[PDB]
Design a protein around this motif. Structure first.
Motif, short mmCIF file in Angstrom:
data_model
loop_
_atom_site.label_atom_id
_atom_site.label_comp_id
_atom_site.label_asym_id
_atom_site.label_seq_id
_atom_site.Cartn_x
_atom_site.Cartn_y
_atom_site.Cartn_z
N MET A 69 2.18 20.51 28.73
CA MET A 69 2.81 20.61 30.04
C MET A 69 1.82 20.93 31.16
SD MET A 69 6.43 22.48 29.24
CE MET A 69 7.64 21.72 28.16
N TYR B 104 -0.13 8.56 31.35
CA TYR B 104 0.71 9.67 31.80
C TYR B 104 2.16 9.44 31.45
CZ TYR B 104 3.11 12.69 35.14
OH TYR B 104 3.91 13.63 35.72
N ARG C 288 16.80 14.10 43.07
CA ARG C 288 17.64 13.15 42.36
C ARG C 288 19.08 13.21 42.84
NH1 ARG C 288 15.94 8.92 39.81
NH2 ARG C 288 14.95 8.88 41.87
N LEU D 126 24.02 13.87 35.96
CA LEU D 126 23.07 14.68 36.77
C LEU D 126 23.68 16.06 37.07
CD1 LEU D 126 22.23 15.62 39.84
CD2 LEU D 126 20.54 15.12 38.07
N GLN E 158 -0.05 18.11 34.82
CA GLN E 158 -0.70 18.48 36.07
C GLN E 158 -2.02 17.74 36.24
OE1 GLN E 158 -1.16 22.69 36.14
NE2 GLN E 158 1.04 23.11 36.06
N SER F 269 19.05 7.69 27.09
CA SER F 269 20.31 7.54 27.80
C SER F 269 21.28 6.65 27.04
CB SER F 269 20.06 6.99 29.20
OG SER F 269 21.28 6.85 29.90
N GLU G 271 24.75 18.11 33.70
CA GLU G 271 23.63 18.70 32.99
C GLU G 271 23.05 19.89 33.74
OE1 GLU G 271 20.49 15.96 32.17
OE2 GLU G 271 19.28 17.40 31.05
N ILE H 148 7.10 24.95 34.76
CA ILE H 148 7.92 23.75 34.51
C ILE H 148 9.38 23.95 34.91
CG2 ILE H 148 8.12 24.42 32.07
CD1 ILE H 148 8.10 20.84 33.60
N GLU I 242 15.06 3.75 28.16
CA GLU I 242 16.40 3.98 28.68
C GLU I 242 17.45 3.93 27.58
OE1 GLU I 242 16.38 4.78 31.81
OE2 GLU I 242 18.51 5.31 31.74
N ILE J 170 13.40 19.20 41.15
CA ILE J 170 13.58 17.76 40.79
C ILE J 170 15.08 17.45 40.84
CG2 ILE J 170 13.89 17.97 38.30
CD1 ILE J 170 11.94 15.36 40.42
N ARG K 128 12.64 9.88 34.71
CA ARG K 128 12.99 8.87 35.69
C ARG K 128 12.36 9.13 37.05
NH1 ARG K 128 17.79 9.56 33.09
NH2 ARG K 128 18.71 7.69 32.16
N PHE K 129 12.04 10.38 37.36
CA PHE K 129 11.26 10.61 38.56
C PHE K 129 9.85 10.10 38.40
CE2 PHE K 129 8.49 13.27 41.20
CZ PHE K 129 8.96 12.85 42.42
N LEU K 130 9.26 10.26 37.21
CA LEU K 130 7.87 9.89 37.04
C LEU K 130 7.68 8.38 37.08
CD1 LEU K 130 6.62 12.29 34.26
CD2 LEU K 130 6.82 12.65 36.74
N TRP L 123 27.45 6.80 35.97
CA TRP L 123 27.40 7.42 34.65
C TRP L 123 26.13 8.23 34.46
CZ3 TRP L 123 25.50 6.79 29.38
CH2 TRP L 123 26.38 7.29 28.41
N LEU L 124 25.18 8.14 35.39
CA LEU L 124 24.08 9.10 35.45
C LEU L 124 24.29 10.16 36.52
CD1 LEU L 124 21.68 9.21 33.65
CD2 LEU L 124 22.57 6.86 33.67
N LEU M 231 10.76 17.13 28.68
CA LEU M 231 11.05 16.85 30.07
C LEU M 231 12.43 16.23 30.16
CD1 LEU M 231 7.58 15.54 31.21
CD2 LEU M 231 8.56 17.82 31.45
N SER M 232 13.17 16.62 31.19
CA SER M 232 14.53 16.16 31.37
C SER M 232 14.55 14.67 31.68
CB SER M 232 15.18 16.94 32.51
OG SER M 232 16.49 16.49 32.77
N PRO M 233 15.62 13.97 31.28
CA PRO M 233 15.72 12.54 31.60
C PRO M 233 15.79 12.22 33.09
CG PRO M 233 17.71 13.35 30.56
CD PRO M 233 16.66 14.38 30.33
N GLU M 234 16.16 13.16 33.96
CA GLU M 234 15.98 12.91 35.38
C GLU M 234 14.58 13.24 35.85
OE1 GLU M 234 18.12 11.39 37.34
OE2 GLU M 234 19.61 11.26 35.76
N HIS M 235 13.80 13.93 35.03
CA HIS M 235 12.41 14.17 35.38
C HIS M 235 11.52 13.02 34.93
CE1 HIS M 235 8.74 16.30 36.28
NE2 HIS M 235 8.34 16.16 35.03
N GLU N 198 11.76 21.56 37.54
CA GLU N 198 13.05 21.01 37.15
C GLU N 198 14.15 21.49 38.07
OE1 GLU N 198 13.31 18.63 34.93
OE2 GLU N 198 15.44 18.46 35.43
N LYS O 28 4.66 19.98 41.24
CA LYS O 28 4.23 19.07 40.14
C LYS O 28 2.79 19.42 39.74
CE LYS O 28 6.79 16.34 38.84
NZ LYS O 28 6.73 14.94 39.32
N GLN O 29 1.94 19.73 40.72
CA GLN O 29 0.54 19.99 40.44
C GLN O 29 0.29 21.42 39.99
OE1 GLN O 29 -1.71 18.98 43.87
NE2 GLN O 29 -1.11 16.82 43.85
#
Lengths: 268, 306, 102
Positions: B111, B136, A167, A191, B115, B186, A194, A156, B182, A163, B154-156, A186-187, B148-152, A160, A151-152
């Motif tokens: 992007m 952020y 998840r 997941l 960071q 989604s 995708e 990118i 959401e 990540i 949701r991670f944030l 449904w996610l 950014l992906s929707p699972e990314h 992903e 992340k830091q």
């Protein structure tokens, strides 16, 4: 004994006293006052000999990470990664003894990597995460601490990639715990559709339609249907539609071979 | 610096101020030996520590860089290393950490500005992280270049939302930003259990009430579960919210009026609630008078207890 | 919270006297062996008589300072409380000791 011989400026008597006292393995208060003694005396070669013995008397990361806080205070890069190389090999060499926990080894891997990020070598920061996760596949903390490094400092697509795994494990552990939360299915399917297109992608869609009775449940099957349909399809459709249909079979016979599969799915 | 900027070029103003900011080998030892030194060790050696020196150095760089920098330019490479050196020296204030992340987002380095938020939040204590997590999470969902992906995303949130409510902050907005986005990406009402957690953390009444409106749009089966969980001064307000839900979709509401009046002292607002439930009908002023009769008798019993 | 153990208290007393020894050398700097007799077996150490003096004076100074810091605590705590009935000083110090229990 010490602060009297400190008061007399007899530096060779407190040194002889500390060598005896740290030979009887007394505890971390003695050693930490013995490494603070040589900082006073500027004996840098002597205090480095103490931490060689101090990690052997108290094998634990807060003694190893204290020794890298010593070296990164002085900025000597050749000495710091030598300590870092000794600290991570001893965890690997002495894996079977089981004296460092999963949260404890995660502090060593992260403090190794974040130092290598400051030393502008990202390829050594990145590769050690792979060897630690493989070397230890058990600890999730080193895997999760791998992610915060990407992340830091990572590009990118690499974040992903990683990540998508965390998840995956977190959606898997809720659905194993909570039985029928149809909105997380449904996610969780989406997941895998995708970012995880593979044999697993088909397999979960079986494992979901395994879990599928509610109004809240059955439309998930509708999702798996078209997910199958977008890509057999009739054969699974008849198996699910068996829930009960005399009018349906009469509706089925008139418009199955006559018209399509989409017409066949319309009955369901 | 300021006299030379007007008389001579900003490159001359950098060069006299570059000599201030040499980070030699080790800032930890020099900072400590200066602090422990009793006025003998000069502050010439620990001159790099001073925030005032860095901010007005940087403000010359951020003013001198063109509006389109795109990372080919020397100066955008120079102000980024001078900004990153402040973070490595760890002397960066949170308004200054926003000025660098804002700096990268104007020059299309979006992007890498994620960071910038990522490095600094660890360093700061909560009650300040809440102002960085707004800036952020908003760039993640609103800024057009951030793909950014929707699972990314949701991670944030659920890295922040779990971390930030753990130290204990009201977190009214982050719940809503994880609630609002959401539908835009989604598009299902998972919003409720995402926003129920605002109501039941371990203001809060103002998060619980707006969303129990929202599922009466979607479906009454997930409304009535909240009406039960909503009731379990502040307690009296929760009872009033339950009565409103009953009116939207009456006996359960009146019995709820009893449950709420018995929840707690005064209860006249609850009387307004039952009166509202009676008024809502387009049946006989009999059950209503019986209701006021029951409430009055309960008040008499309370007076007897007192 | 809670109390401090004796090994921790001995370290902090160890660290405090080093700072007294650090500033004593700083206040001095601001203003400006081993012989083992083989027959007897004894070891003799030659050291500066000034540093033996400064060791002896500082211990007497720390002894008097704690003697005075307690003496004022004796004179204050005798003249703080007079509400509850007492008879003598040993009754007063005991019923105050009951107050620290609760």
């Amino acid at each position: 004994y010490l602060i009297v011989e400190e008061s007399l400026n007899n530096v060779e008597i407190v040194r002889s006293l500390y060598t005896k006292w740290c030979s009887l393995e007394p505890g971390v208060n003695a050693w930490n006052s013995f490494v603070d003694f040589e900082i006073r005396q500027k004996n840098w070669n002597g205090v480095r000999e103490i931490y060689s013995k101090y990690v052997m008397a108290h094998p634990q990361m807060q003694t190893w990470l204290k020794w890298v806080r010593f070296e990164n205070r002085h900025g000597n890069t050749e000495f710091t990664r030598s300590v870092y190389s000794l600290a991570i090999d001893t965890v690997a060499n002495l894996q079977n003894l089981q004296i460092w926990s999963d949260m404890e080894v995660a502090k060593l891997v992260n403090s190794f990597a974040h130092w290598e990020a400051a030393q502008q070598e990202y390829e050594r920061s990145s590769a050690l995460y792979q060897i630690a996760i493989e070397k230890w596949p058990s600890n999730q903390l080193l895997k999760a601490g791998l992610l915060d490094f990407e992340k830091q400092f990572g590009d990118i697509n690499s974040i992903e990639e990683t990540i998508s795994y965390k998840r995956k494990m977190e959606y898997e552990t809720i659905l194993s715990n909570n039985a029928y939360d149809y909105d997380t299915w449904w996610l969780y399917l989406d997941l895998i559709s995708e970012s995880f297109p593979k044999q697993i992608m088909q397999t979960f869609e079986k494992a979901i339609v395994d879990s599928r009775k509610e109004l809240s449940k059955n439309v998930q099957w509708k999702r798996y249907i078209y997910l199958w349909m977008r890509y057999v399809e009739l054969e699974l459709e008849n198996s699910l539609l068996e829930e009960e249909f005399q009018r349906l079979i009469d509706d089925i016979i008139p418009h199955k071979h006559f018209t399509k599969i989409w017409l066949m799915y319309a009955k369901f | 610096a300021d006299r030379e900027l007007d008389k001579e070029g900003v490159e001359r103003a950098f060069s006299i101020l570059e000599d201030a900011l040499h980070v030699p080998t080790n800032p930890e030892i020099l900072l400590e030996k200066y602090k422990n030194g009793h006025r003998k060790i000069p502050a010439q050696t620990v001159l790099f520590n001073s925030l005032r020196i860095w901010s007005k150095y940087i403000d010359y760089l951020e003013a001198y860089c063109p509006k389109d920098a795109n990372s080919s330019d020397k100066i955008f490479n120079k102000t980024k290393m001078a900004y990153n050196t402040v973070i490595d020296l760890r002397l960066i204030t949170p308004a200054m950490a926003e000025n660098f992340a804002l700096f990268l987002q104007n020059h299309y380095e979006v992007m890498e500005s994620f960071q910038v938020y990522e490095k600094t939040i660890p360093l700061f204590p909560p009650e300040i992280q809440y102002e960085l997590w707004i800036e952020y999470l908003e760039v993640a969902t609103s800024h057009q270049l951030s793909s950014l992906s929707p699972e990314h995303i949701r991670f944030l949130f659920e890295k922040a939302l779990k971390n930030l409510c753990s130290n204990g902050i009201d977190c009214k907005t982050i719940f809503i930003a994880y609630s609002v986005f959401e539908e835009r990406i989604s598009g299902l009402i998972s919003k409720s259990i995402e926003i129920l957690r605002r109501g039941a953390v371990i203001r809060l009444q103002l998060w619980r009430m707006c969303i129990s409106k929202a599922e009466s749009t979607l479906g009454p089966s997930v409304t009535r579960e909240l009406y039960q969980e909503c009731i379990q001064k502040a307690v009296e307000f929760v009872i009033k919210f339950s009565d409103f839900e009953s009116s939207i979709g009456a006996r359960e509401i009146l019995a709820y009026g009893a449950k709420l009046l018995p929840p707690s002292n005064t209860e006249l607002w609850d009387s307004f609630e039952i009166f509202e439930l009676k008024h809502g009908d387009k049946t006989y002023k009999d059950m209503l008078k019986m209701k006021k009769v029951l409430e009055s008798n309960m008040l008499i019993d309370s007076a007897s207890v007192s | 919270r809670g109390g401090i153990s004796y090994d921790q208290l001995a370290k902090l007393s160890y660290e405090k006297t080093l700072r007294n020894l650090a500033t004593q050398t700083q206040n001095s700097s601001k203003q400006d062996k081993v012989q083992k007799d083989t027959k007897t077996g004894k070891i003799t150490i030659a050291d500066d008589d000034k540093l033996v003096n400064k060791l002896a004076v500082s211990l007497q100074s720390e002894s008097k300072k704690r003697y005075e810091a307690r003496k004022r605590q004796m004179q204050n705590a005798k003249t703080l409380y007079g509400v509850e009935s007492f008879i003598n000083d040993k009754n007063k110090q005991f019923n105050e000791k009951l107050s620290r229990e609760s």
